[PDB]
Amino acid sequence: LEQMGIAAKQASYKLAQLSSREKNRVLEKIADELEAQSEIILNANAQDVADARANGLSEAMLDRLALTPARLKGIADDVRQVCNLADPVGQVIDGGVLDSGLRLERRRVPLGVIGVIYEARPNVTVDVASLCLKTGNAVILRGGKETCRTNAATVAVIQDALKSCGLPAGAVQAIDNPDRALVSEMLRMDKYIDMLIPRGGAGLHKLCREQSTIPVITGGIGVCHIYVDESVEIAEALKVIVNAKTQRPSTCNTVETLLVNKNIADSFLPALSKQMAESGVTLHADAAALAQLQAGPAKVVAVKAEEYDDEFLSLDLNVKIVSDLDDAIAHIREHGTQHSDAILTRDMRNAQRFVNEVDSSAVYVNASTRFTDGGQFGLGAEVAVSTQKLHARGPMGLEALTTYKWIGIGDYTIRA
Amino acid sequence: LEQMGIAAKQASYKLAQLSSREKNRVLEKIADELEAQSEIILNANAQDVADARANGLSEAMLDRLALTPARLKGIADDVRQVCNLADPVGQVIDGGVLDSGLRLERRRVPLGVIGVIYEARPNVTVDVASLCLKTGNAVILRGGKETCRTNAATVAVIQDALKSCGLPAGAVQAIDNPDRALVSEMLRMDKYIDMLIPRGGAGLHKLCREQSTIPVITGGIGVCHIYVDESVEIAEALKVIVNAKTQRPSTCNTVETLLVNKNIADSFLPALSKQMAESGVTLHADAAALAQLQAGPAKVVAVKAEEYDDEFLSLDLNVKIVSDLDDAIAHIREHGTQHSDAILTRDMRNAQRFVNEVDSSAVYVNASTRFTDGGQFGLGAEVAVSTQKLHARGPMGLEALTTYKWIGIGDYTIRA
Ligand SMILES: NC(=O)c1ccc[n+]([C@@H]2O[C@H](COP(=O)([O-])OP(=O)(O)OC[C@H]3O[C@@H](n4cnc5c(N)ncnc54)[C@H](OP(=O)(O)O)[C@@H]3O)[C@@H](O)[C@H]2O)c1
Ligand SMILES: NC(=O)c1ccc[n+]([C@@H]2O[C@H](COP(=O)([O-])OP(=O)(O)OC[C@H]3O[C@@H](n4cnc5c(N)ncnc54)[C@H](OP(=O)(O)O)[C@@H]3O)[C@@H](O)[C@H]2O)c1
């Protein structure tokens, strides 16, 4: 794969030296070509979905795999939105004049070569390629073993567009082979890749962090908690919970654990049990909440200790009764994965304390956890939702793929 | 060492929850106590310098280790200057109102627990402790074997101040044993320290990147190049080079390789030889410049292939004659460590090309490479100069020790 690395570096130099007009032109060509070849991509994705259904995959997994024409138009519109955004290369962050007469400033520059290891989702290839082209980085992709044909067709379209627009061919490339030995080799390829973005579960992150030399921005799994305070509207809270759970339960920002204040559980729990039975969501309750949730129509089973630290990725929910805000904060800190946290309350003090004392990539007050998305947050699209602390955090947009450089212009200045 | 980490985390929570007034009070008390107890620090540093010189340490190394009363007053003034800076915690980076009615914003927050492994330099301890206190981080320091008594006294003073002002004693900790097994043990504590700052030569960074599981911001070694164009003022270039080389040659932002355009080399080289000899600097010339530099009084020796990639850390310079700007850029890319580069020229186009095409943490036009400092760049003080690309680059100020967090407020908002 060393030839891939050298090609990526050679293309990255020229990309960093490009102008905004050429990048916008290539993005427009990519979007137009995506719209033109809808039939091929749709047929390949349908065939792949039919193949995956033979293995008895989960309904949520199939929904993630599925690609309707509406979704294709959505990804095309996202590419166009990225095109309409301002180019973040060359922008001045700040500047000034020092005491010695030196004119100093900070200017944004690209990062170099970016490696991406993503899950089985079709659109992610498009978004990553568009963001990397707009910013000025060469990208090496390694997708999941399921979406082989869809990723093949999409990367073929992207590379055809790159060739037609005159950009170097090594700007964007992908690894077709699904063997994980090549994944290890990519991880060891330190002299070429400048930064690696793994998206996936615990196993991929474990293996990567074990055997990585490149800087890593871990996508991380998401255990998102929702805290229900004593003073809250029942109907609105139920609507928010239903939206945060039912809609697309296969994502990573879907709520997984529900923390209910003990002074409200006498009234909130029964209604919830009525609502979940409508959506068919199984309730993994604690011992304290089991007695109240037993009479509810919705099916309820006792929870286990290890279930608090993993994602259900289905129509399941953890119900726990806490004593006060301090207990909820302690539980979130202990079991949370620092992805997204929400509080439903009517107290200004409680909302302020929750916002202050909870460390996460995103904290919401009277809102659903499903807002942790690149498109929703105002950015054109996202490459991954970083849960670490270094470099970017939360959704990673155009500015998350760029670094900065100090430039100082003087007149034969000498440091005193 | 685990108890050290537990104390660090427990102190980090409370420190992140503090206010600006308390941190400023602690810093002012620290500076006052440093000025009050100058005698003990001076005695310890003098004894350490005597012991080091008894081992035949280099003159530049001894100058780095030496701490005069003027230097002590300077570090006290820098601590006070930091105390006078604005607290970066809580600042709003940006924000807005989204389409769905959700008010989004970004707020700065402390990183957490910070581990520092640094060279033998007395002032770095105080600077790191002050910055970590001001930001709201807990710090674990592990200094060089030389600075033992000085670091012991300074850490005693800081711990006493923290105890007196009521802050938890676990905020600032240091390791006294110079064994490197403890260094490895600190390296292996991933879940407890949040970010590591190693300062040192290639050996320390190699060992850290070999067996580290914590995010690392490498200080890195510094090979700083200066390119002399065809048309330039001889006297001004000479004085800038003299300032960049002679003054404090033991630092890391000192010029090592001098690139001279062949068109000007017929006249620039002799004058340089007349000046450099007055400074007593040996010239490790290349083959092309060997004939011209021989007549000059300055000492000249043939350069070796490996000398281009290592710092002299003394009064030594590398003279290489290049063809044009493209050759200089290629050489800088090949051999540079991406620390600080400068160009002395009278052409606007050449300056623009050099600024655009050279990838370094700092690029200067008609200036010196000695400006790559935390204090010079307007920041109060720096913990290290980062030569990597992730997180901060160049000097690391107050904001380099803080990350950000998304906050979203809504009225039971639902994602559409
Ligand atoms: N944090 C974020 O921004 C974000 C975004 C999207 C998804 N996610 C997470 O994605 C997870 C589900 O992803 P998934 O359904 O695709 O399953 P997964 O097992 O998490 O996917 C792992 C990814 O890496 C590969 N992989 C798996 N095991 C590997 C190993 N041992 N060595 C090398 N590569 C390996 C997989 O392809 P192969 O199996 O073919 O090797 C796949 O591309 C959820 O937990 C969710 O939280 C997070
Ligand atoms: N990039 C920057 O911002 C920056 C700033 C300052 C200095 N520097 C660099 O500092 C260098 C000189 O530093 P120096 O004179 O102190 O020498 P050094 O050998 O670079 O110092 C290494 C530092 O780490 C320790 N260390 C050395 N070998 C180690 C090992 N195998 N395992 C663990 N710890 C180890 C040393 O103390 P022990 O030997 O007792 O272990 C010392 O604290 C220059 O090359 C300069 O460029 C860079």
SS3 assignment for chain B: CHHHHHHHHHHHHHHHCCCHHHHHHHHHHHHHHHHHCHHHHHHHHHHHHHHHHHCCCCHHHHHHHCCCHHHHHHHHHHHHHHHCCCCCCCCEEEEEECCCCCEEEEEEEECCEEEEECCCCHHHHHHHHHHHHHHCCEEEEECCCCCCHHHHHHHHHHHHHHHHHCCCHHHEEECCCCCHHHHHHHHCCCCCCCEEEECCCHHHHHHHHHCCCCCECCCCCCCEEEEECCCCCHHHHHHHHHHHHHCCCCCCCCEEEEEEECCCHHHHHHHHHHHHHHHCCEEEECHHHHHHHHCCCCCEEECCHHHHHCCCCCCEEEEEEECCHHHHHHHHHHHCCCCCEEEECCCHHHHHHHHHHCCCCEEEECCCHHHCCCCCCCCCCCCCEECCCCCCCEECCCHHHEEEEEEEEEEEECCC
CA of B205, nearest ligand number? 2
CA of B374, nearest ligand number? 2
> How many distinct structural domains can be found in chain A?
2
Kindly determine whether residue B389 and residue A237, on different chains, have CB atoms separated by under 8 Å: no
Q: How far is A344 from chain B (nearest CA, A)?
A: 8
Q: How many other β-carbons are positioned within 10 Å of the β-carbon of residue A295?
A: 10
Q: Is residue B359 part of a domain?
A: yes
Q: Which of A405, A408, A373 is nearest to A89 (CA)?
A: A405
Give the CATH number of the domain where residue A57 resides: 3.40.605.10
Is B70 buried (19+), middle (13-18) or exposed (0-12) by CB count in 10 A? Answer: exposed
Length of chain B equals 416
Q: Which of B88, B415, B23, B399 is nearest to A243 (CA)?
A: B415
Q: Which of B12, B405, B409 to mutate to test the interface with A (most CBs of A within 10 A)?
A: B405
Does residue A221's CB lie within 6 angstroms of at least one atom of ligand 1? yes
**Encoded amino acid at B312, one letter:** F
Q: Is A217 helix (H, G, I), strand (E, B) or coil?
A: coil
Backbone angles phi, psi at A106, to 5 degrees: -120, 130
Is B27 buried (19+), middle (13-18) or exposed (0-12) by CB count in 10 A? Answer: buried
- Concatenated DSSP letters of A244-271: HHHSSTTSSSSEEEEEEETTTHHHHHHH
**Encoded amino acid at A199, one letter:** R
Residue A143's H or E segment, with its range, is none
Kindly determine whether residue A98 and residue B394, on different chains, have CB atoms separated by under 8 Å: no
Q: Is A319 helix (H, G, I), strand (E, B) or coil?
A: strand
Contact predicate A317/A336, CB 8 Å: no
C-alpha A264/C-alpha A254 separation (Å) is: 23
Q: Which residue has the tokens 């710090």?
A: B139
Contact predicate B114/B174, CB 8 Å: no
Q: Do B207 and B109 share a structural domain?
A: yes
C-alpha B121/C-alpha B144 separation (Å) is: 8
β-bridge partners, A138 = A113
Q: How far is B355 from chain A (nearest CA, A)?
A: 8
C-alpha B366/C-alpha B345 separation (Å) is: 7
Q: Do A24 and A60 share a structural domain?
A: yes
Is B225 buried (19+), middle (13-18) or exposed (0-12) by CB count in 10 A? Answer: buried
Cβ-Cβ contacts under 8 Å for A305 (sequence gap 6 or more): none
Q: Is A21 helix (H, G, I), strand (E, B) or coil?
A: helix
Q: Do B205 and B66 share a structural domain?
A: yes
Contact predicate A229/A347, CB 8 Å: yes
Does residue B370's CB lie within 6 angstroms of at least one atom of ligand 2? no
Kindly determine whether residue A215 and residue B109, on different chains, have CB atoms separated by under 8 Å: no
Q: How many other β-carbons are positioned within 10 Å of the β-carbon of residue B16?
A: 19
Does residue B178's CB lie within 6 angstroms of at least one atom of ligand 2? yes
C-alpha B21/C-alpha B114 separation (Å) is: 22
Residue of chain A whose alpha carbon sits nearest to that of B213: A209
CA of B189 to the centre of ligand 1 (A): 26
Encode B24-87 in three state secondary structure.
HHHHHHHHHHHHHCHHHHHHHHHHHHHHHHHCCCCHHHHHHHCCCHHHHHHHHHHHHHHHCCCC
Encode A344-383 in three state secondary structure.
ECCCHHHHHHHHHHCCCCEEEEEECHHHCCCCCCCCCCCC
Contact predicate B317/B276, CB 8 Å: yes
Does residue B201's CB lie within 6 angstroms of at least one atom of ligand 2? yes
> Using CB atoms and an 8 Å cut-off, which of residues 69-128 of chain A contact chain B?
96, 98, 100, 102, 104, 109, 111-112
Q: Do B150 and B28 share a structural domain?
A: yes
Q: Is residue B377 part of a domain?
A: no
Q: Is residue A386 part of a domain?
A: no
Q: Is A406 helix (H, G, I), strand (E, B) or coil?
A: strand
Joined together, the tokens standing for residue B209 give: 């990147």
Residue B415 has its nearest CB partner, among A100, A209, A368, at: A368
Residue B412 has its nearest CB partner, among A239, A370, A376, at: A239
Q: Do B152 and B17 share a structural domain?
A: yes
C-alpha A219/C-alpha A396 separation (Å) is: 10
Residue of chain A whose alpha carbon sits nearest to that of B215: A390
β-bridge partners, B261 = B322
Contact predicate A369/A115, CB 8 Å: no
Q: How many other β-carbons are positioned within 10 Å of the β-carbon of residue A20?
A: 14
Report how this structure was experimentally obtained. cryo-EM
Does residue B183's CB lie within 6 angstroms of at least one atom of ligand 2? yes
C-alpha A394/C-alpha A416 separation (Å) is: 43
DSSP class of residue A86 equals: P
Q: Do B182 and B74 share a structural domain?
A: yes
CA of B251, nearest ligand number? 2
Does residue B256's CB lie within 6 angstroms of at least one atom of ligand 2? no
Residue A65's H or E segment, with its range, is helix A59-65
Joined together, the tokens standing for residue B64 give: 């780095």
CA of B58 to the centre of ligand 2 (A): 15
C-alpha A49/C-alpha B50 separation (Å) is: 76
Is A75 buried (19+), middle (13-18) or exposed (0-12) by CB count in 10 A? Answer: buried
C-alpha B255/C-alpha A231 separation (Å) is: 65
Q: Which of B228, B406, B409 to mutate to test the interface with A (most CBs of A within 10 A)?
A: B406
Q: How far is B292 from chain A (nearest CA, A)?
A: 26
Residue B389 has its nearest CB partner, among A194, A366, A368, at: A194
Backbone angles phi, psi at A187, to 5 degrees: -60, -35
Phi/psi region, residue B330 (left: phi>0; alpha: psi -120 to 50; beta: rest), is alpha
C-alpha B349/C-alpha B365 separation (Å) is: 12
Kindly determine whether residue B368 and residue A111, on different chains, have CB atoms separated by under 8 Å: no
B333 touches chain A (CB under 8 A): no
**Helix A348-357 × helix A325-335 angle, to 10°:** 20
Does residue B222's CB lie within 6 angstroms of at least one atom of ligand 2? yes
Ligand 2, atom 13, residue with closest C-alpha: B200
Does residue B203's CB lie within 6 angstroms of at least one atom of ligand 2? yes
C-alpha A114/C-alpha A383 separation (Å) is: 11
Contact predicate A250/A313, CB 8 Å: yes
C-alpha B216/C-alpha B210 separation (Å) is: 11
Longest dimension (CA), chain A: 82
Joined together, the tokens standing for residue A27 give: 């993005």
CA of A201 to the centre of ligand 1 (A): 5
Residue of chain A whose alpha carbon sits nearest to that of B241: A414
C-alpha B122/C-alpha B395 separation (Å) is: 19
Joined together, the tokens standing for residue A275 give: 């609502």
Q: How far is B265 from chain A (nearest CA, A)?
A: 20
C-alpha B96/C-alpha B253 separation (Å) is: 41
Q: Is residue B378 part of a domain?
A: no
C-alpha B401/C-alpha B386 separation (Å) is: 12
Q: Is residue A27 part of a domain?
A: yes
Q: Which of B95, B90, B107 is nearest to B404 (CA)?
A: B107
Does residue B394's CB lie within 6 angstroms of at least one atom of ligand 2? no
Kindly determine whether residue B409 and residue A367, on different chains, have CB atoms separated by under 8 Å: yes
Q: Is residue A416 part of a domain?
A: no
C-alpha B336/C-alpha B225 separation (Å) is: 7
Length of chain A equals 416
Q: Is residue B383 part of a domain?
A: no
C-alpha A8/C-alpha A140 separation (Å) is: 8
Q: Do A241 and A336 share a structural domain?
A: yes
Give the CATH number of the domain where residue A362 resides: 3.40.309.10
C-alpha A401/C-alpha B390 separation (Å) is: 10
Does residue B311's CB lie within 6 angstroms of at least one atom of ligand 2? yes
Q: Do B213 and B232 share a structural domain?
A: no
Q: Is A291 helix (H, G, I), strand (E, B) or coil?
A: helix
Domain extent for A360: 224-371
Residue B408 has its nearest CB partner, among A213, A371, A409, at: A371
Q: Which of B275, B370, B104, B170 is nearest to A102 (CA)?
A: B370
Joined together, the tokens standing for residue A200 give: 């996936």
DSSP class of residue A235 equals: H
Contact predicate B298/B261, CB 8 Å: no
Does residue B270's CB lie within 6 angstroms of at least one atom of ligand 2? no
Q: Do B166 and B24 share a structural domain?
A: yes
Q: Which of A233, A253, A231, A232 is nearest to A244 (CA)?
A: A253
CA of A197, nearest ligand number? 1
Residue A185's H or E segment, with its range, is helix A180-188
Write the CA distances from B315 to A28, A111, B243, B247, B254, integer angstroms: 56, 35, 12, 10, 10
Does residue B374's CB lie within 6 angstroms of at least one atom of ligand 2? no
Q: Is residue B298 part of a domain?
A: yes
Does residue A64's CB lie within 6 angstroms of at least one atom of ligand 1? no
C-alpha B384/C-alpha A375 separation (Å) is: 36
Ligand 2, atom 30, residue with closest C-alpha: B204
Ligand 2, atom 37, residue with closest C-alpha: B144
Q: Is A212 helix (H, G, I), strand (E, B) or coil?
A: coil
Cβ-Cβ contacts under 8 Å for B60 (sequence gap 6 or more): B249, B250, B313, B314
Radius of gyration of chain A (CA): 24
Is the CA virtual torsion B54, B55, B57, B61 positive or negative? negative
Q: How far is B295 from chain A (nearest CA, A)?
A: 28
Q: Do B355 and B298 share a structural domain?
A: yes
Reported resolution, Å: 3.0
Q: How far is A241 from chain B (nearest CA, A)?
A: 10
Q: Do B367 and B230 share a structural domain?
A: yes
Kindly determine whether residue A391 and residue B391, on different chains, have CB atoms separated by under 8 Å: yes
> Using CB atoms and an 8 Å cut-off, which of residues 176-235 of chain B contact chain A?
194-195, 209, 213, 215, 217, 233
Q: How far is B58 from chain A (nearest CA, A)?
A: 24
Q: Do A284 and A205 share a structural domain?
A: no
DSSP class of residue A166 equals: T
User: Which ligand 1 atom lies nearest to the CA of residue A146?
Assistant: 40
Q: Which residue has the tokens 């992709």?
A: A141
Residue of chain B whose alpha carbon sits nearest to that of A195: B390
